[PDB]
């Protein structure tokens, strides 16, 4: 009858990442028997925060390289110039990212 | 062909609100997609393991919160906990 129009619960949570897709992936990923209502909201918020942090640091590195587009080296620099992000992505190799420019001081 | 979903449009929506005039290459978008899937499976595995440790059948936002607090190092965990908490509190009043 008076069926209200659909609002995405991403927009209800004020988020950009999909709460419904995160809920479906939790529900199909064999993690538990049940998934609460606030769990995909919380998880989509955490994933959006981490994405925003890395993209903003990589955009700052791209602007410091006088460039407009973010390439994998910009992500490599943004992650490896950061103690907490380097500890998080410790056993992670980024393709086409290169290395940090580290020369040992005794050689100079 | 199959549908082959990803996080690319969502990473792009986040990118064009942290830097409105900055693009991203397709290889860097693939790396961000791999990052989001990796952190998803890491947090979901830790929350699953917590719910199995405490003999619970349901993964809730409290399990997601303590999995975030176990997995993220330092101030990263504190700001992710504040973001997840404010998203849940403005979701419940809606």
């Amino acid at each position, epitope marked *: 009858k008076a069926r209200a129009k659909a609002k995405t619960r991403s927009s209800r949570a004020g988020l950009q990442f999909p709460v419904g897709r995160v809920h479906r992936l939790l529900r199909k990923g064999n993690y538990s028997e049940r998934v609460g209502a606030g769990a995909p909201v919380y998880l989509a918020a955490v994933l959006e925060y981490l994405t925003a*942090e890395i993209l*903003e*640091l990589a955009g700052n590195a791209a602007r410091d390289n006088k460039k407009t587009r973010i390439i994998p080296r910009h992500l490599q620099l943004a992650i490896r*110039n*950061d*103690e*907490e992000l380097n500890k998080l992505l410790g056993r992670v190799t980024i393709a086409q990212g290169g290395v*940090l420019p580290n020369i040992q001081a005794v050689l100079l | 062909r199959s549908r082959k979903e990803s996080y690319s449009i969502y990473v792009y929506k986040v990118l064009k609100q942290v830097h409105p005039d900055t693009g991203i290459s397709s290889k860097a978008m693939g790396i961000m997609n791999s990052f989001v899937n990796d952190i998803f499976e890491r947090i979901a595995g830790e929350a699953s393991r917590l719910a199995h440790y405490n003999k619970r059948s349901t993964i809730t936002s409290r399990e997601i919160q303590t999995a975030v607090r176990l997995l993220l190092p*330092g*101030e*990263l965990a504190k*700001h992710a906990v*504040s973001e997840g908490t404010k998203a849940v509190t403005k979701y419940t009043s809606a």
Partner: single-chain antibody
Framework: EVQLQQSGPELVEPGTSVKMPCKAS????????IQWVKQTPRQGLEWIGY????????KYNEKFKGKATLTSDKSSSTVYMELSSLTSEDSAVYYC?????????????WGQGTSVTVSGSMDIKMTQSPSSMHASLGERVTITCKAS??????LSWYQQKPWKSPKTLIY???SLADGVPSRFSGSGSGQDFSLTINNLESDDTATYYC?????????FGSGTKLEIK
């Protein structure tokens, strides 16, 4: 807890150079930048620069290129600061502040202060519209921090009692710092920002600063001195 032990005052001659330590304790030393702030009582608070001891990476304000040199020591958990070519304007208090590498984090914990006593257009102007106001013991106080450019939410609030180090009140324009009661509340985004105290007390008599850290030269506010009967 987190303590940034900083040395006592110096009474030095012009043309010389002064080092000052910021020996930090209570946290993992390489996980956090150490920022440096000059406080002259003619220009308020000014950001000098930082070192990040994880990779010894520095960044300086353009007003202090060549004047300041920041070094670190992982073994002693200490950050030093060179002050070359001392002049009459280099007579101030030099704070060292603890800041995470997180973009929304702010100057969390401050040093005691080092009183050194001698013997620019593309920056963001932070305009606090009340310079001083008077208050009762329970009424409402609202302070604005109108900004020049678009910082998104990277604005933080500080209170400084006289002859003391600043204390962090609010970070990320809304979030309360640790140990700060809910009487303090922040609002706004973009260029309009606000600071609000609900139940005024005796210890709320201080100078209230706003700091932006959205763009790479960090700028403070002019300050707002609050007198409470």
């Amino acid at each position: 807890e987190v303590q940034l032990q900083q040395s006592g005052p110096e009474l030095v001659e012009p043309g010389t150079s002064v080092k000052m330590p910021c020996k930090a304790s209570g946290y993992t030393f390489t996980s956090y930048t150490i920022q440096w702030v000059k406080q002259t009582p003619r220009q308020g608070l000014e950001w000098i620069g930082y070192i990040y001891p994880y990779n010894a990476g520095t960044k300086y304000n353009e007003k202090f290129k060549g004047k300041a040199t920041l070094t670190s020591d992982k073994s002693s958990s200490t950050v030093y600061m060179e002050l070359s070519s001392l002049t009459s304007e280099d007579s101030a208090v030099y704070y060292c502040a603890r800041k995470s590498s997180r973009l929304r984090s702010t100057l969390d914990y401050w040093g005691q202060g080092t009183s050194v006593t001698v013997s620019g257009s593309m920056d963001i102007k932070m305009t606090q519209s009340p310079s001083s106001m008077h208050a009762s013991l329970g009424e409402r106080v609202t302070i604005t921090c109108k900004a020049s450019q678009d910082i998104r939410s990277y604005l933080s609030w500080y209170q400084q009692k006289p002859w003391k180090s600043p204390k962090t009140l609010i970070y990320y324009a809304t979030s309360l710092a640790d140990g700060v009661p809910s009487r303090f509340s922040g609002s706004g985004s973009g260029q309009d920002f606000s600071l609000t105290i609900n139940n005024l007390e005796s210890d709320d008599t201080a100078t209230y600063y706003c700091l932006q850290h959205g763009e790479s030269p960090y700028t403070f506010g002019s300050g707002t001195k609050l007198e409470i009967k």
